[PDB]
Assembly symmetry: C2
Homo-oligomer: 131 residues x 2
């Protein structure tokens, strides 16, 4: 509901920064999507759709049960999980795609901080790595 709103918003925000690698995983394949500029964005009900010229991402936000904020040795990822804990979607931040200043972990901390409010969020951020 309102969570689904927030989730969608979080995904749209991450996308537009252009610093993220979005990945969708089936039982035998994974798709990796880059970009920060959409030809089309759409939130119809509980469905999120992002369209670039040569890739489209469709997400069923209602399936999302947990959101993991990972920051470990350094990987910075946000992981959207099924009700059976299966990843429906993964957003990984990449330092190569991120300005030198501030520090990549600072940028990612600053972002995740806006969102730790959410009940289904699960904080796995190693703060010691940011400061």
């Amino acid at each position: 509901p309102g969570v689904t709103d927030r989730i969608g918003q979080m995904i749209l925000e991450m996308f537009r920064t252009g610093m993220c690698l979005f990945s969708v995983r089936s039982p035998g394949g994974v798709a990796e999507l880059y970009g920060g500029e959409a030809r089309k964005v759409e939130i119809t009900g509980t469905s999120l759709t992002i369209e670039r010229e040569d890739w489209h991402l469709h997400c069923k936000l209602e399936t999302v049960e947990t959101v993991v904020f990972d920051l470990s040795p350094i990987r910075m990822a946000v992981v959207f999980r099924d009700k059976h804990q299966a990843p429906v979607l993964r957003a990984a931040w990449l330092p190569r795609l991120m300005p030198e200043t501030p520090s990549p972990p600072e940028q990612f901390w600053a972002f995740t901080q806006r969102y730790i409010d959410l009940p289904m969020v699960v904080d796995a951020r190693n703060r010691q790595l940011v400061f």
Copy 2:
């Protein structure tokens, strides 16, 4: 083995036609990939990798148990031309859909799709669910 080589060969050839939509499906998301020119292609044992400027596809060919060739009418009207790679549980691991808008106007999309897939019909793991009527009225 040599099978794995042909599966990979098939995916690559479909990609190179540029008339396909590849899709990968998680339990609550699907990515749809377009284009027919890669900057980088890579085969590593049973893994295939296709990279364009803003998307990469990785496929663990070993998980492919059956390849469904589907040519059949959609309910909304229109013709479905898809290749579906499925694992041991019939979970789709990858899908290549063919798109009339990205294909020549002649011969008919159904004929082009038929000719391409026919080349692979002898593969033991292929499941031929193409309706012949849509190509050869008879």
